[PDB]
């Protein structure tokens, strides 16, 4: 942490404070003032031409200015060797994650006119010409090409940034190898744990950031779409019922699987411990004819067998819950729109867009639990590295 970034706690606190200040100044206040000064109409196109529209351009300029000011302050206040990768690289990663979320939002918005046109074409034969379908698919292809290029460059930069972090930590450890030689497992640490920690922390941060912006982007969309859904299937009319029933469904899918699966990582650890003890007794018996005796090895394999059967039986409940949720979720999106389909309040395009927003929101709620799972191994590797570094000091 102290090798790649500047002073970690202060750096992260200042980054969060400046991000909050910029969000407050833009999303409520000076953002509309800058839009009026530049003359942005605010009519965001549905095609791929929205990403160089005036609103997007002024947001890009504002983000660049804010990040540049923050970076200049942190460069002058506390210069660092890896400041360009730690500060500007993280900002670029965050911006590209936001851009990918915006591309997903644009595709979701495109989903409505396309399926409205499909329904119109299916209403009567040869009512809609095929050139309209070609134009719609061309618009989607433009958006998808933008997404492909941005995602590929994002993966490239993410991998290089992770390796720069590993390089910084490796440089720090080698600068102190003469004092860290005597610590047990130092070679394993410096070789594998550095890269594993860097990749794991990068993945957790990106997943959490993407989960946050996916909700921030697709909650207003769902609120807007809920105006065409005046009634829910059984309960009836509930104010903002679509948003409530989507958030509740996603909370069930992320908080029931976790509750029925809290003992899973506490059992995989036991299975890894008994197998490790089995291997320890085996290796102790390699250069020894008296150890790894038939009874000692039998009573050690019986333990791993019995602790594996526990995991196999406890995963049954999690499997039932997860598979049942995944099978129900296929049609639970349409279930909430059944009264609207019957009453003719939504079209085919709006129904497809709503079912897409449901999936993206569920994906964000899945990214959250995935980030927690990543944080588990992150805490493990951080404990290892912290002990290794503290034994030096």
């Amino acid at each position, epitope marked *: 942490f102290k090798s790649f970034f500047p002073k970690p706690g202060t750096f992260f606190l200042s980054a969060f404070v400046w991000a909050l200040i910029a969000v407050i100044f833009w999303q409520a206040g000076g953002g509309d003032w800058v839009a009026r000064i530049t003359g942005a109409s605010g009519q965001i196109p549905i095609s791929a031409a929205r990403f160089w529209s005036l609103d997007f351009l002024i947001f890009y300029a504002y983000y660049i200015v804010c990040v540049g000011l923050f970076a200049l302050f942190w460069f002058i206040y506390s210069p660092h060797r890896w400041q360009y990768w730690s500060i500007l690289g993280t900002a670029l990663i965050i911006f590209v994650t936001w851009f990918l979320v915006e591309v997903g939002v644009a595709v979701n918005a495109w989903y409505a006119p396309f399926y409205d046109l499909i329904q119109t074409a299916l209403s009567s034969p040869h009512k809609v010409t095929i050139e309209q379908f070609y134009r719609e698919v061309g618009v989607f292809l433009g958006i998808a090409l933008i997404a492909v290029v941005i995602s590929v460059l994002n993966n490239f930069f993410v991998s290089h940034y992770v390796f720069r972090w590993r390089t910084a930590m490796n440089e720090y450890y080698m600068a102190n190898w003469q004092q860290l030689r005597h610590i047990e497992g130092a070679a394993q640490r410096v070789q594998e744990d550095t890269m594993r920690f860097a990749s794991t922390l990068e993945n957790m941060g990106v997943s959490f950031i993407n989960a946050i912006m996916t909700l921030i982007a697709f909650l207003p969309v769902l609120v807007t779409l809920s105006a065409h859904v005046p009634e829910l299937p059984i309960i009836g009319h509930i104010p903002y019922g679509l948003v409530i029933a989507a958030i509740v469904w996603s909370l069930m899918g992320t908080g029931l699987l976790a509750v029925v699966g809290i003992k899973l990582p506490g059992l995989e650890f036991k299975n890894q411990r008994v197998e490790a003890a089995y291997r320890k007794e085996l290796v102790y018996g390699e250069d020894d004819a008296t150890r790894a005796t038939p009874p000692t090895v039998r009573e050690l394999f019986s333990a791993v067998r019995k602790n594996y059967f526990r995991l196999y039986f406890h995963y049954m409940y999690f499997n039932i819950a997860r598979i049942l949720y995944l099978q129900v979720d296929n049609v639970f999106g349409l279930f909430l729109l059944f009264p609207s389909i019957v*009453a003719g309040t939504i079209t085919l395009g709006l129904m497809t867009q709503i079912t897409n927003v449901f999936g993206q929101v569920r994906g964000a709620f899945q990214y959250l639990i995935n980030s927690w799972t990543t944080l588990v191994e992150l805490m493990s590797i951080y404990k290892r590295l912290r002990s290794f570094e503290h034994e030096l000091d």
Partner: nanobody
Framework: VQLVESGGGLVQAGGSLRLSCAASGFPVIANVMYWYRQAPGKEREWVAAIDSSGEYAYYADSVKGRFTISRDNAKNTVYLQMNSLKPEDTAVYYC????????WGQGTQVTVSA
């Protein structure tokens, strides 16, 4: 429940027109009440919907903003007000409520000449 539509007639392009859908029978105080329309040569189209309390109103894309739906729960009536009437908003307007079974209003003809 016997829905009855009153109001609506001949207006020019741009104007105001109010319709009253009054129920007479089982109370509709706890039902979402809908306004549909049917243009000559097309199938019926959703226009508006109002909940039981009348606080939440839902509008179609083609009539959003220009149309306002309110409900007088005491009188068991639902009022639809059209403002800035385009000539495309000519149709037979129907009132709908599902109290156990479906109840469709008799519908009133609204003409908006250019």
């Amino acid at each position: 429940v016997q829905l009855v539509e009153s109001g609506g007639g001949l207006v020019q392009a741009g104007g105001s027109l109010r319709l009253s859908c009054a129920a007479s029978g089982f109370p509709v105080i706890a039902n979402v009440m809908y306004w549909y329309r049917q243009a000559p040569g097309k199938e019926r189209e959703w226009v508006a919907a109002i909940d039981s309390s009348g606080e939440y109103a839902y509008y179609a894309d083609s009539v959003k903003g220009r149309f306002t739906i309110s409900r007088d729960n005491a009188k068991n009536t639902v009022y639809l007000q059209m403002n800035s009437l385009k000539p495309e908003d000519t149709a037979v307007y129907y009132c709908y409520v599902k109290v156990g079974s479906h109840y469709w209003g008799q519908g009133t003809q609204v003409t908006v000449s250019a």
